[PDB]
Write a protein that binds this DNA or RNA. Structure first.
Ligand SMILES: [Mg+2]
Lengths: 686, 1296
DNA sequence: GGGTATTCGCCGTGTACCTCTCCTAGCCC
DNA sequence: GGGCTAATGACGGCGAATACCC
RNA sequence: AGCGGAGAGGUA
């Protein structure tokens, strides 16, 4: 690099404008006094005091050129040079032995620690001010040309040219023996220019946009520490659009053919060099871009057990980066396992993820031994496993593992699971019927086989063929809900092992898919039912609130207590409507058993998706069947009028405008919560 | 109706409510503001700055008028030339010269002959500005209105319960003025967010003493020294005192306070002056100075407490005039005395010196300069310029009776001493208003007088300024700059020795208007992919800009919706993500008022019935009247039978009897915008899913053959008409000739000699690389009317809007493919040319001159085989209509380096193929053209001669028919008009030849520039994002053959299989009802096609149309003709369209009746057999027709990969982006996710040897290609750059 | 003397991607 | 047109600096 | 011929 010879000294702004000001602790002065002194507005004699020009002339008229006083960088340079810190340490030690005030004690220990650090480091106190200022190397900043033979502007080059111009003007004015006022003005201008070069925007913000400096392109968002040190752009990467694929195992993922050709291109070159079909890399590259048939054979042969890395770009926890063994598929979309996307939290509405290719000899083992998807089964937060069946699997598993009152093919005794599978496919028995089957299950203490009898359904007997032998049938005889299948996955992972749990989670998704494609559930305008007494309860509440409004307008009850009792009886009416809707949805279906009618759980489209999980709560069913209650206001209050209509019935502009207030506030809260969660995650990491 | 464009297709509208006002013009506000911009607008900005008074030369000049010239270039030629669609602006000024050392008289009245300055971009088409060949639009800004509004901070200073209040006088464009309180009970001001200063400094700068300031606010109590006069209604509700008896009758004893009945008994007693004890007035404060009558010494000054020595001095002096301040505990606060006791400045000159020191920091003050600086801050017209809406808000908030007034602020004491000409005018109309003192008094009434506080959240405090006001502001800035330049240029001038055109310069005003229109925060690059996006981008208000808030700061209050937004600002069309709430949208019936506020129409409601009258109300006018909502049932044509109609008073929905209502809404489509009203059944779906659907419907792609939506709205005939994408007939008549790109219409004799001719636009490039085209629909010999359509544009139908295609929908989980918002397709969607659009990509290739030599486009290109030289012509340009592949050579170009040239030919981007449709060559003047440019020029002059003599023959035939219709009886005007039209056509042909043969505009430094247009047909593939109208966005999954798809009992195969798991999750139900209504429409269409397939009579078809059109909106099928009904039945072979309004929609009974009218089941859901196995299902599914749309988020512009790419110069790192081979950025959290696993070997290899190392990036490649495995670890180059940057800061850092 | 009481100033505010335009400028021949 | 020639619509938290009643 | 910085829009 290079340097600039300055005729006048100039002090650094990092040791002056900072809040623990080191010069103010060294010279035992304040910040405003040294600010007025260093910018040529006062005088320092050489004990230390603020002194203006009239005091200077009245002292020079009586001192007869015997009391010298300098102003600017020379005075603070002489004050930093002529001090002896070895005697000053003992003097401030006597000062801390004498003075006992608490803030004076804090300032004394701060000054003693600073002097101790300065004498231990060996640095001179005169090195705060500087005479020779170095510059950056010319390769560190480019002069990027534009279209038409132009040149783009820079930020540090203009400040450097301003510093060199002011230094040359000051040198010419010092050589030509200028009067003192213009020399002081040029020294002040050079001080402001150097202080703007070192940290722009801290003193005067020298420009309609303030350009960056040496302290702005390191500290901040666009600094070097957070752009080119921690996270750098790497090669052997690329994004795509995710697409769900059910015909692949959880230890493998899909990959486009052109992406696999562009990512593993040096491995293709090495394989073509080893096989001898191409002499040079240029002929091999021309054979690759000419797109023959042997190139795809080489590409299919070179990546068989070579793992890659997958990573969604918004990541939250440690399971955002996993490893898969890719296979070559068609199209331009990466195929992914459906059970992996629970950990990624990746919806399929056009989300992108960037891949990474480990190419060293140790990175493949590091990605296989501790980053494969068959090893990241449990979450780092709690002990529950992340392999939970999603919205499509648990619906078929809940439709398969329930029972009704009277169906065809019930009452008969079966032999084993194979007899059930042989009698189900030819449609001689129903999917769910109260039958008595015989199953064999081993006992672990150690393997101890045992044969007993049990009474269950046909679907739960068909589910007994894919579970491992370590699980008893009593953990699966209950209807497969969300928490029940989570407990079943945890019990399969606890006392059995890993690989059998992996293949059990592999077969469970295929069974759920093959039964969900046979069920054919659909929600329509006929399945969503309304309560019969809803209009009567609404008219009763309307008569009650009309009587309350008449008693309020007649002059008995104040407006606040009337509003409180109105929203109280409307919340009671909403709770009664929700209870009536749950009663008319859950106990809707009726059946007969040997002639006599019996009640049972209904098999409606909305009730199955509500009770099986992986959907909204009972509030989402209340908003679709009965009244949605009372909506809120952004300032904190509750609206007096209710919404006496569900989403099935029509809505007017008033309740829609009332619901918009609660709709937009949730979006704003999720945006602010995402920003604060990112900031809290960064602080908790650091 | 029964027009020509409406007799071809009639949609059945399910609208039970009446319509009092039709849907107005959509983009009328921008074109109205630009028409009003060209005395308000531009003329006020001219007249406010052009009076110039010279100092020494005494040379003044005044303008007399302005005139806009003719645009020399049409916009169709301006889109290809690359210049701006502008017009010359010539100002006609007059220059006078006053004779020095004499009377006020002019010497010569010399006037400049239309001196040219600036160039304004003319608004053409539908509101799109063209600056560099790209259509740019200027959205409207939503900022705070100028005026005075008050606010209070909650828990800001000292966490006290006493909320401090603040004031702010907002001007139009000038200096601000604030008034805030303090927890130390002292008012403080600040000017332009500077350091604070007490209020007594500004009042002393106004010219007010203390004895006239403190005496006008509070009342005075006269003391006689010490008995004082009993002020009535003063001690009531105040601090208690000792016993006071009026005539030895003490009604109130000691220790008690005067109540209301005690005050009444005291006022009914005839009070007088009572003997006040001496221990009461010691706590008061004197009002003014008290001096001796004989001596005259200042023993007691003003704003001082009355102690015992001052009391004895006043008793010795005998001064009976002792006034005190009426200071209570809560009703009266002594804030002015607390501000006066702090500042020690007593004179006006020291106050002006302190003002000049607080304004100019570090500068020596001057007594002659502070008076000049204080005059050009708040009391001048050239620097403050408070507009009329600010004066209206001032008079509305303060409480003045008159609305109009003076623009500049007026003071009583400041303008009384001035003897200027403008100062004598303001003091004659005003009556010492003292607006600053009135602001201080209103703030005092806010603090202690219990006033009201208004928050900045209404539409009465926010104004909407359009393109005209911002253009007038930037032209005012440029005019002030050119006025200063003209003042410096003509400070000393002669009579006629110099020209007036050399005084003013067009360069700063042209640079200012170019910087405003080219690159600013309000010039948004529009998206011309759809007519709906084109009409919703111009009708959009925003709060971001130079005069508003930014999206980076916190906006948690301004992102929430206010009850003022009902009817003026749409609450649905709001983009989610970073700025959710800051980018709003205008309503359907909303418009801009005369001041800038938003006004919405309402209906005048009489106390008995509702009248058919409209009246636009603003936001500050709806708080007084009780406006009724849409829940008003009607029995008669105008009647209210409800005892309690729901209405709103101040945004709170309450119940009121119908004898007190004043206003009612005009239409249920008042709340939503034009982009949210087209979604069918908006009342059933949730608000967030409707907000997602309104943005999913904004970025569609027009397909090849667009089909109409079966479930529409009925307001789609205006959103496609007001966008201007389709041509409309100005005068109806007979279509003489028609072609694929030209429509000739003959104007009839009613609305008439020259007939009109239209030129339809062919396949050109839009702003988002989308192909647009206009295809006609009428035939020859047709009789059209004024306002009908002739050609449908991209994604356009016969007069309704059509975005995509209708496909079959079956809600069923199909083998786990529809997993999480995933979409399954069929083979018959791909093979029937349904979702294959056309994208047009532009490629350029310039040829400049370097220091060695200029580059040519010759065909002798080295290292090029004959496989690519066959497509090139002799000139080096590829042939028109030639199929090009990925990586071929289209424009040959060589660069000399030094026989030995370097290849710099334009290459095709990979993965893109298609034909070359248009080749445009831009040559420089003075350079000889090649064979391709000569062929383009001869084809252009042949085509323009063809259209010229075709129009001449058409006009000659029209004139010959017009004279032949008149010479049949028993003349010169026809042949005179024919000769005039021939001369006009000859002049137009000469101008076209001179504009074609001239050298076009290029960049300074280039020689030749060619542009090649490509056309690629984008197919549908797995990985493509596709959404619906009800708000269900997702990606496609697979392309299944048609034999493996579910099928009904008839034989129809379902094309699209959805996921039924999203209905309870997203809580929307309107999509299933849309599916059922589309199924009913397809059933009626199939029944109509089955009835029309056989030779049946028209009477049964007319009875069927009368049964399906107007059930239990009344239209007659026997009105048009007998064959028009057959044409309408033939046009409805795919399904009769349904029109459902936004809030007055159809119930389930009408849709059930429509399902039962055809051969369809009642419940709308049937069973279907599987296609994989052939067996039946267990539960019946919903089958229907849902309208879909293809999004612009393609898969070709998303996926990419790279291994070796370019590196930078600062840090040895790869670039970023899909262009220029940029690798994907490894995030900061990805390194933490890697380090949570441990695995240091895959973290060191993915950080150092992959990208950052200058030696490891070659060594790892060499080890991979060769076969060995030996890596070298080292420090990256970025750490070396960081330590070399730290070493340049005089800080030693060495790697020890 | 002395021990806090406002008061001024410094510090900061998620990740990743896609597309478009516009930049140093100005001034008397 | 030309060629060298030089704003005021952010908000919360924490540490030093006079400074004011005691 | 590779490399730069601002302004606006959109998906997650
Ligand atoms: Mg997503």
């Amino acid at each position: 690099m290079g340097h600039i010879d300055l005729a006048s000294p100039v002090a650094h702004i990092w040791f002056l404008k900072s809040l623990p000001s080191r010069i103010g602790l060294m010279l035992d002065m304040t910040l405003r006094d040294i600010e007025r002194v260093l910018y040529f507005e006062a005088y320092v004699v050489t004990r230390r005091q603020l002194l203006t020009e009239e005091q200077y002339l009245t002292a020079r008229q009586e001192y007869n050129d015997d009391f010298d006083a300098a102003m600017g960088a020379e005075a603070v340079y002489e004050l930093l040079r002529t001090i002896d810190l070895q005697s000053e340490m003992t003097r401030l030690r006597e000062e801390i032995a004498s003075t006992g005030s608490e803030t004076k004690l804090k300032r004394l220990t701060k000054r003693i620690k600073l002097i101790e650090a300065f004498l231990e480091s060996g640095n001179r106190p005169e090195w705060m001010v500087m005479t020779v200022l170095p510059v950056l190397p010319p390769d560190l900043r480019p002069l990027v040309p534009l279209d038409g033979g132009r040149f783009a502007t820079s930020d540090l080059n203009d400040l450097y040219r301003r510093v060199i111009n002011r230094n040359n003007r000051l040198r010419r004015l010092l050589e030509l023996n200028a009067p003192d006022i213009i020399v002081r003005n040029e020294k002040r201008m050079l001080q402001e220019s150097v202080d703007a070069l070192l940290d722009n925007g801290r003193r005067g913000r020298a420009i309609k946009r303030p350009l960056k400096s040496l302290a702005d392109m390191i500290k901040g968002k666009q600094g070097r520490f957070r752009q080119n040190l921690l996270g750098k752009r790497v090669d052997y990467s690329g994004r795509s659009v995710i697409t769900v694929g059910p015909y692949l195992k959880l230890h493998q993922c899909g990959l486009p053919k052109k992406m696999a050709l562009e990512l593993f291109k040096p491995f293709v070159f090495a394989k073509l060099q080893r096989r001898g079909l191409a002499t040079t890399i240029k002929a091999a590259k021309k054979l690759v871009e000419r797109e023959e048939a042997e190139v795809w054979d080489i590409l299919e042969e070179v990546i068989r057990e070579h793992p890659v890395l997958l990573n969604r770009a918004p990541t939250l926890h440690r399971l955002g980066i996993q490893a898969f063994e890719p296979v070559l598929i068609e199209g331009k979309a990466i195929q992914l396992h459906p059970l992996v996307c629970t950990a990624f939290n990746a919806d399929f509405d056009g989300d992108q993820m960037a891949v990474h290719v480990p190419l060293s000899l140790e990175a493949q083992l590091e990605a296989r031994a501790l980053m494969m998807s068959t090893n990241n089964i449990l979450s780092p937060a709690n002990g529950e496993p992340i392999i939970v069946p999603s919205q499509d699997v648990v619906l078929g598993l809940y439709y398969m593992s329930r029972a009704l009152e009277n169906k065809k093919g019930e009452g008969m005794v079966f032999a084993n699971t194979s007899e059930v599978k042989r009698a189900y496919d030819n449609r001689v028995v129903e999917l769910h019927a109260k039958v008595k089957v015989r199953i064999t299950q081993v006992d672990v203490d150690k393997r101890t086989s045992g044969t007993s009898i049990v009474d269950t359904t046909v679907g739960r007997a068909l589910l007994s063929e894919i579970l491992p032998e370590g699980l008893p049938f009593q953990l699966a005889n209950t209807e497969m809900t969300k928490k029940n299948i989570s407990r079943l996955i945890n019990s399969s992972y606890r006392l059995l092992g890993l690989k059998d749990t992996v293949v059990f989670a592999d077969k469970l998704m295929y069974t759920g898919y093959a039964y969900a494609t046979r069920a054919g559930v659909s929600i329509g305008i006929d399945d969503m039912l309304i309560p019969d007494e809803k209009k009567g309860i609404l008219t009763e509440a309307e008569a009650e609130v009309l009587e309350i409004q008449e008693q309020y307008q007649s002059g008995l009850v104040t407006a606040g207590e009337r509003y409180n009792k109105v929203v109280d009886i409307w919340s009671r009416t909403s709770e009664r409507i929700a209870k009536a809707m749950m009663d008319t949805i859950g106990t809707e279906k009726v059946e007969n058993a040997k002639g006599e009618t019996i009640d049972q759980k209904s098999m409606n489209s909305l009730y199955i998706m509500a009770d099986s999980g992986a959907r909204g709560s009972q509030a989402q069913i209340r908003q679709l069947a009965g009244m949605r209650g009372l909506m809120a206001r952004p300032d904190g209050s509750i609206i007096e009028t209710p919404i006496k209509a569900n989403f099935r019935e029509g809505l007017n502009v008033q309740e829609y405008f009332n619901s918009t207030h609660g709709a937009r506030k949730g979006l704003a809260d999720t945006a602010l919560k995402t920003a604060n969660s990112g900031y809290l995650t960064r602080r908790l990491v650091d | 109706s029964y027009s020509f464009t409406e007799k071809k297709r009639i949609r059945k509208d399910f609208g039970k409510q009446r319509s009092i006002l039709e849907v107005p013009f959509l983009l009328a506000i921008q074109v109205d503001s630009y028409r009003e911009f060209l005395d308000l607008g531009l003329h006020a900005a001219l007249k406010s700055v052009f009076p110039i008074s010279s100092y020494s030369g005494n040379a003044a000049l005044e303008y007399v008028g302005y005139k806009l010239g003719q645009p020399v270039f049409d916009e169709r030629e301006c889109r290809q030339r690359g210049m701006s669609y502008g017009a010359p602006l010539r100002v006609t000024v007059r220059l006078v010269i006053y004779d020095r050392e004499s009377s006020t008289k002019a010497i010569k009245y010399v006037k400049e002959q239309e001196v040219y300055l600036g160039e304004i971009p003319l608004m053409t088409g539908n509101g799109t500005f063209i600056v560099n060949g790209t259509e740019r639009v200027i959205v409207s800004q939503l900022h705070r209105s100028p005026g005075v509004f008050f606010d209070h901070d909650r828990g800001k200073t000292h966490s006290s319960g006493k909320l401090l209040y603040s004031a702010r006088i907002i001007p139009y464009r000038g200096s601000w003025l604030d008034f805030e309180f303090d927890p130390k009970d002292a008012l403080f001001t600040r000017i332009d967010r500077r350091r604070k200063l007490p209020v007594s400094i500004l009042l002393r700068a106004l010219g007010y003493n203390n004895e006239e300031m403190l005496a006008e606010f509070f009342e005075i109590n006269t003391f006689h020294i010490v008995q004082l006069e009993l002020v009535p209604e003063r001690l009531r509700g105040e601090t208690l005192n000792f016993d006071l008896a009026d005539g030895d009758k003490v009604i109130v004893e000691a220790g008690k306070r005067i109540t209301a009945r005690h005050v009444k008994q005291l006022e009914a007693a005839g009070v007088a002056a009572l003997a006040v004890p001496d221990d009461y007035l010691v706590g008061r404060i004197l009002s003014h100075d008290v001096v001796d009558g004989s001596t005259g010494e200042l023993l007691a000054n003003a704003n001082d407490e009355i102690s015992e020595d001052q009391l004895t001095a006043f008793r010795k002096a005998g001064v009976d005039a002792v006034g005190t301040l009426w200071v209570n505990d809560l009703d009266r606060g002594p804030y002015l005395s607390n501000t006066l006791r702090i500042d020690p400045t007593k004179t006006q000159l020291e106050a002006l010196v302190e003002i000049y020191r607080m304004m100019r920091p570090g500068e020596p003050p001057t007594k002659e300069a502070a008076q000049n600086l204080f005059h050009n801050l708040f009391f001048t017209f050239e620097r403050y310029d408070l507009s009329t809406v600010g004066r209206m808000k001032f008079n509305r908030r303060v409480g003045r009776k008159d609305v109009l007034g003076e623009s500049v602020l007026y003071d009583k004491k400041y303008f009384a001493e001035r003897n200027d000409e403008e100062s004598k005018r303001l003091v004659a109309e005003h009556t010492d208003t003292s607006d600053i003192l009135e602001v201080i008094k209103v703030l005092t009434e806010i603090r202690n007088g219990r006033g009201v506080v208004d928050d900045i959240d209404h539409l009465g405090n926010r104004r909407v300024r359009s393109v005209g006001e911002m253009a007038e502001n930037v032209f005012r800035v440029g005019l002030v700059r050119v006025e200063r330049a003209v003042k410096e240029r003509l400070s000393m001038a002669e009579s006629e020795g110099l020209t007036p055109q050399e005084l003013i310069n067009a360069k700063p005003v042209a640079a200012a208007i170019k910087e405003f229109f080219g690159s600013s925060q309000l010039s948004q690059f529009m998206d011309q992919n759809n007519p709906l996006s084109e009409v919703t981008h111009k009708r959009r208000v925003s709060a971001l800009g130079p005069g508003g808030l930014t999206r980076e700061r916190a906006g948690f209050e301004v992102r929430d919706v206010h009850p003022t937004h009902y009817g003026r600002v749409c609450t649905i069309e709001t983009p989610e993500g970073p700025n959710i709430g800051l980018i709003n949208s205008l309503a359907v019936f909303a418009r801009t008022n005369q001041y800038g506020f938003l006004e919405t129409p309402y209906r005048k409601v009489l106390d008995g019935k509702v009248s058919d009258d409209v009246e636009y109300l603003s936001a500050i006018e709806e708080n007084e009247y009780v406006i009724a909502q849409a829940n008003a049932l009607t029995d008669a044509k105008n009647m209210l039978t409800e005892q309690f109609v729901p209405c709103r008073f101040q945004g709170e929905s309450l119940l009121k009897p119908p004898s007190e209502v004043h206003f009612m809404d005009v239409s249920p489509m008042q709340t939503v915008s034009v982009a949210a009203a087209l979604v069918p059944f908006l009342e059933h779906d949730d608000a967030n899913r409707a907000l997602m659907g309104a943005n999913m419907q904004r970025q569609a792609v027009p397909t090849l053959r667009s089909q109409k939506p079966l479930v529409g709205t009925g307001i789609e005939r205006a959103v496609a008409r007001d966008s201007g994408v389709t041509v409309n007939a100005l005068r109806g008549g007979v279509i003489e000739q028609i072609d694929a790109a030209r429509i000739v219409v003959k104007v009839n004799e009613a609305e008439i000699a020259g007939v009109d001719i239209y030129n339809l636009i062919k396949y050109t490039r839009s702003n988002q690389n989308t192909c647009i085209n206009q295809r006609p629909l009428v035939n020859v010999g047709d009789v059209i009317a004024r306002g009908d359509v002739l050609a449908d544009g991209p994604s356009t139908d016969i007069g309704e809007l059509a975005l995509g295609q209708n496909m079959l929908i079956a809600f069923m989980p199909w083998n786990g493919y529809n997993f999480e918002d995933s979409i399954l397709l069929s083979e018959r969607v791909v093979e029937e040319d349904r979702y294959t659009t056309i994208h047009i990509e532009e490629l350029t290739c310039v040829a400049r001159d370097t220091k060695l030599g200029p580059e040519e486009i010759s065909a002798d290109i080295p290292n090029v085989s004959e496989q690519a030289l066959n497509r090139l012509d002799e000139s080096g340009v590829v042939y028109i209509g030639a199929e090009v592949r990925a990586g071929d050579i289209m424009v040959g170009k060589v660069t000399p380096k030094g026989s030995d040239v370097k290849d710099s030919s334009l290459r095709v981007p990979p993965g893109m193929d298609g034909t070359v449709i248009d080749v445009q060559v831009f040559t420089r003047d003075g350079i000889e053209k090649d064979k391709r440019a000569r062929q383009i020029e001869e084809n252009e002059i042949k085509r323009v001669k063809k259209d010229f003599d075709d129009q001449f023959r058409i006009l000659e035939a029209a004139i010959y028919a017009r004279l032949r219709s008149q010479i049949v009886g028993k003349i010169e005007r026809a042949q005179k008009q024919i000769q005039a039209h021939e001369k006009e056509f000859e002049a137009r042909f000469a101008d076209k030849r001179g504009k074609i043969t001239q050298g076009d505009d290029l960049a300074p430094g280039v020689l030749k520039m060619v542009k090649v247009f490509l056309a690629v047909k984008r197919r549908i593939q797995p990985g493509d994002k596709m959404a619906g109208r009800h708000g269900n966005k997702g990606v496609v999954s697979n392309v299944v053959p048609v034999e493996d798809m579910p099928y009904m009992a008839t034989g129809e195969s379902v094309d699209i299989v959805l996921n039924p798991l999203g209905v309870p999750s997203r809580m929307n139900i309107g999509q299933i009802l849309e599916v059922h209504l589309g199924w009913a429409a397809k059933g009626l269409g199939r029944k109509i096609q089955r009835m029309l397939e056989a030779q049946a009579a028209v009477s049964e078809l007319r009875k069927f149309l009368d049964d399906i059109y107007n059930h239990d909106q009344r239209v007659d099928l026997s009105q048009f003709s007998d064959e028009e009904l057959l044409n309408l039945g033939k046009n409805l072979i795919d399904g009769v369209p349904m029109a459902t309004p936004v809030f007055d929609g159809a119930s389930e009974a009408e849709i059930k009746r429509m399902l039962e009218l055809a051969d369809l089941p009642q419940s709308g859901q049937t069973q279907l057999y599987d296609g994989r196995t052939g067996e039946a299902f267990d539960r019946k599914t919903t089958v229907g027709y849902m309208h879909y749309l293809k999004l612009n988020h393609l898969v070709d512009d998303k996926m990419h990969a790279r291994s070796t790419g370019p590196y930078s110069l600062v840090t040895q790192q790869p670039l970023g982006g899909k262009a220029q081979f940029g690798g994907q950025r490894f995030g900061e959290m990805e390194v933490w996710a890697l380090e949570a696993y441990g695995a240091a070997y895959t973290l060191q290899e993915m950080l150092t040897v992959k990208s950052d190392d200058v030696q490891g990036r070659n060594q790892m490649y060499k080890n991979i290609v060769d076969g060995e495995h030996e890596m070298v670890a080292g420090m990256p180059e970025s750490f070396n750059v960081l330590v070399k940057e730290i070493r340049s800061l005089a800080i030693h850092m060495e790697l020890e």
